[PDB]
């Protein structure tokens, strides 16, 4: 779910903060220098190995907690280095190396929960902003119908995925109108009326079975 | 006497044979006739699919196709639920 | 963090499992069928009631099993019924009514916190519906991909068209179509002269996917 | 049933798992150290105690779950430390201290791998796997026609039963070609060849009845 960067003099997320490996979160590694601050990106927390370097660790906190770094900044420290951790660090939270899995889970939901979007996916031109319930395809918005917008994303987030209309029936109609699924074909028209040839091929047809979504290249 | 009719089987055999009509007739009549001679129940001789071509004017492979069309749709439990009591 | 589903006719989680009240993990209940797969949505855990009825729970776990990709499937029994608990149910854990709150919570965290494998010289991508063999490009459309995947997934399991209609097709079954023949020939031709011997025909019964080598 | 090496610096397994003496499992015991990693050998499953040392218990379960250790690993923990244990320790199953003996047997069977062989028919040295459709003899593939195999499996699956030609026609040659009994002998003549005399004892013939199979000693 959430992306983390681990600033460290070590090579793996296991010795620095082991309970991130006890989590299904994704943690990348980096050296403990300022250029690794250019490696954060669209992450949600950045965790400095300050378990040995307390002065240089707090310096990396001060460069991380500067003016416009909206990713909430973290350090991992020993228990005899927590006495150095104060308001002059500029940290958001603190995490011991002995911290549990669900403990780091709740601390991450307190420090996270820069407003990283949840359901904002971008399939090339197809920029499906489900936070706004709008999909941009080649810039101009898609003024599909209410249930047309749903179908497009269900084909999009299942890129390359072929299904029979019955399976599509469960993800568009659900438990309603089981027979006479033809309108999906008409609804493909309602999709292509607002897509055009630039991406009219992005919805691949599958004769006798259904359709499919094509990944642009 | 080993040759005694259990007389539950006989009544139940008639019930088997009648559920057979009730199930076949609820199926298509082409298929009902196909099986009536394929297993040769109403007759003495079960038939092969190239005898059926004369009586039904179609390629034996098409009766290969129809045999599954019978069985699988039969293999919908609706036919099976009412017939599984017969054993 | 999770929703738990109980396939139970007890209509209540605490007679089935007392500890489930002390955990804030919320539980929905459905009667003991496989059809209650339509009942579950974003629930990360589903449990099968097997406390009073053992073989019913074994059959419902058999129907609820590892197909894709897979959801955590659990089943709960008594202590003397622990002998029939085996791997053939389709499980990742076993629970009892004597299981506690921290115990249930930790086993749930074990199952939720693995990866499909598809190698025959033949890249198989269960979600991607992509195929590769002796080269990146091996165009597999839907009907032949799951088809071939079923064969490669069941390498050597002699398959007959009757067996494919209920798996590769839905199906009606629109069986006895010979479309497997043209489908397999495409699979034979598209896969090229090499790896064309994996999908071999065993007469009178169909085909089997010879393993490599 | 299982040769089990317990990882405890305590000498006895009964303070560790009190129910473990109640089963015929042979519990070798070795100190809670890395050197016990060399003493794995033919241990069925390894028992790592993390009832008390959860940090070094995590270390030992990581040690027994390294790149080439297929021996399944059990973390044996407290109830207030089960929530510290998850799939990060390289695990498939864990055991509490109040785990019952039938519960120990069940979870040990489940952590080892029950696993019954498929339609693997076995008649003396001739073992048939109808799945792959090989009636291999002593491991070498055997080459029968379509009918011989089904002829053979029927007798193999019904060894000892005295069948008749008329009888066997039905279940081998289906409902067709209803005459010509001697198809059996011409086929039997090939069966008795491709079986080899070393195991024609399996194939029995009684005059005036037909053929059968006999289980060898």
């Amino acid at each position: 779910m959430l992306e983390l960067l681990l600033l460290t003099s070590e090579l793996y997320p296991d010795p620095v903060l082991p309970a991130l490996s006890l989590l299904p979160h994704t943690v990348r590694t980096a050296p403990a220098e300022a250029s690794s601050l250019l490696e954060a990106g669209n992450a949600d927390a950045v965790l400095v190995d300050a378990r040995n370097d307390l002065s240089s660790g707090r310096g990396l906190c001060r460069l991380l907690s500067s003016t416009g770094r909206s990713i909430p900044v973290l350090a991992v420290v020993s228990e005899g280095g927590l006495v150095a951790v104060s308001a002059d660090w500029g940290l958001d939270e603190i995490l011991l190396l002995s911290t549990g899995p669900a403990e780091i889970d709740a601390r991450l939901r307190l420090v996270v929960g820069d407003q990283e979007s949840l359901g904002k996916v971008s399939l090339g031109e197809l920029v499906i902003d489900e936070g706004t319930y709008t999909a941009r395809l080649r810039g101009r918005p898609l003024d599909l119908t209410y249930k047309e917008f749903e179908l497009l994303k269900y084909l999009a987030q299942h890129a390359g995925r072929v299904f029979t209309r019955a399976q599509l029936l469960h993800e568009v109609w659900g438990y309603d109108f089981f027979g006479g699924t033809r309108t999906v074909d008409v609804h493909v028209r309602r999709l292509r009326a607002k897509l055009g040839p630039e991406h009219e091929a992005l919805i691949g047809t599958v004769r006798n079975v259904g359709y499919k979504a094509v990944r642009p290249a | 006497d080993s040759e005694a009719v259990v007389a539950v089987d006989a009544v139940s055999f008639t019930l088997l044979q009648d559920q057979l009509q009730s199930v076949l007739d609820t199926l298509s009549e082409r298929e009902a006739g196909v099986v009536r001679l394929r297993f040769g129940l109403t007759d003495g001789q079960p038939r092969t699919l190239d005898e059926i071509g004369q009586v039904y004017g179609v390629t034996r492979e098409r009766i290969r196709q129809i045999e599954s069309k019978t069985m699988s749709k039969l293999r919908h439990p609706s036919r099976s639920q009412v017939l599984r009591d017969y054993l």
Side-chain angles (χ1 to χ4, degrees), chain A residues 1-135 137 139-147 149-156 158-160 162-166 168-174 177-205 208-217, chain B residues 1-2 4-46 48-80 82-87:
Chain A
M1 199 62 54
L2 308 178
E3 188 182 5
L4 302 101
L5 181 56
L6 208 74
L7 308 188
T8 172
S9 45
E10 277 65 77
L11 276 300
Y12 207 81
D14 292 341
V16 179
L17 185 51
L20 301 171
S21 76
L22 269 154
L23 270 164
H25 287 310
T26 76
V27 178
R28 310 176 290 111
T29 179
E33 214 73 30
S35 66
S36 80
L37 270 71
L38 288 79
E39 303 274 294
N42 200 0
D44 282 340
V46 168
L47 283 62
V48 181
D49 175 34
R51 297 176 294 116
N52 45 0
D53 48 351
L54 278 154
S55 49
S56 181
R58 205 210 281 176
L60 296 190
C61 303
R62 188 164 295 275
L63 309 170
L64 272 170
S65 198
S66 69
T67 74
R69 295 185 70 89
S70 318
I71 305 182
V73 289
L74 265 298
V76 50
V77 77
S78 87
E79 208 189 334
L82 285 161
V83 296
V85 182
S86 316
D88 64 333
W89 277 50
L91 281 182
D92 293 281
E93 287 289 323
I94 192 65
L95 293 159
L96 277 171
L97 72 153
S98 65
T99 317
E103 213 178 348
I104 289 178
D105 178 74
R107 297 324 163 283
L108 275 170
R109 297 172 307 108
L110 270 175
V111 66
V112 174
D114 51 339
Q115 281 195 0
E116 207 274 311
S117 198
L118 283 76
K120 183 263 288 183
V121 66
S122 171
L123 183 66
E125 289 79 359
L126 176 45
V127 181
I128 310 172
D129 307 331
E130 291 301 324
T132 79
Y133 198 68
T134 71
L137 181 71
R140 82 292 178 283
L142 293 164
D143 63 358
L144 306 165
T145 61
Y146 173 40
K147 198 195 76 186
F149 176 82
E150 171 265 325
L151 171 48
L152 185 67
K153 60 157 168 272
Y154 165 55
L155 284 164
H158 297 56
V162 191
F163 318 94
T164 188
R165 300 139 195 111
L168 319 180
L169 182 135
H170 296 285
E171 304 308 318
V172 173
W173 290 265
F177 293 88
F178 301 88
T181 67
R182 186 215 296 277
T183 181
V184 72
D185 307 345
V186 186
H187 267 285
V188 171
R189 188 61 251 194
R190 266 82 66 91
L191 291 180
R192 292 168 161 154
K194 286 84 158 189
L195 298 323
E198 183 178 1
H199 295 290
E200 190 172 4
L202 289 198
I203 308 299
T205 63
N208 305 80
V209 60
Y211 312 98
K212 66 186 288 186
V214 186
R215 287 198 69 82
Chain B
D1 190 359
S2 68
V5 287
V6 164
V8 189
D9 52 354
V11 287
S12 69
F13 199 67
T14 52
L15 269 294
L16 280 149
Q17 288 147 306
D18 293 28
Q19 186 97 56
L20 185 55
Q21 297 326 110
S22 70
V23 165
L24 282 175
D25 295 331
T26 56
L27 292 171
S28 181
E29 302 324 285
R30 309 198 57 206
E31 304 170 284
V34 171
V35 181
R36 267 152 210 167
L37 317 167
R38 188 260 169 289
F39 270 101
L41 177 53
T42 47
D43 47 299
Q45 300 83 241
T48 299
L49 278 56
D50 188 74
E51 294 86 297
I52 315 181
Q54 64 180 20
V55 182
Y56 286 155
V58 65
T59 176
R60 51 190 190 119
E61 193 52 64
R62 209 78 162 86
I63 304 103
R64 287 176 173 85
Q65 186 177 9
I66 206 169
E67 276 323 298
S68 182
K69 211 58 170 171
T70 299
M71 296 291 168
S72 172
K73 293 187 167 212
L74 278 155
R75 276 172 194 119
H76 293 114
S78 80
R79 283 70 172 273
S80 311
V82 297
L83 205 48
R84 186 35 74 167
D85 54 351
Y86 279 97
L87 178 151

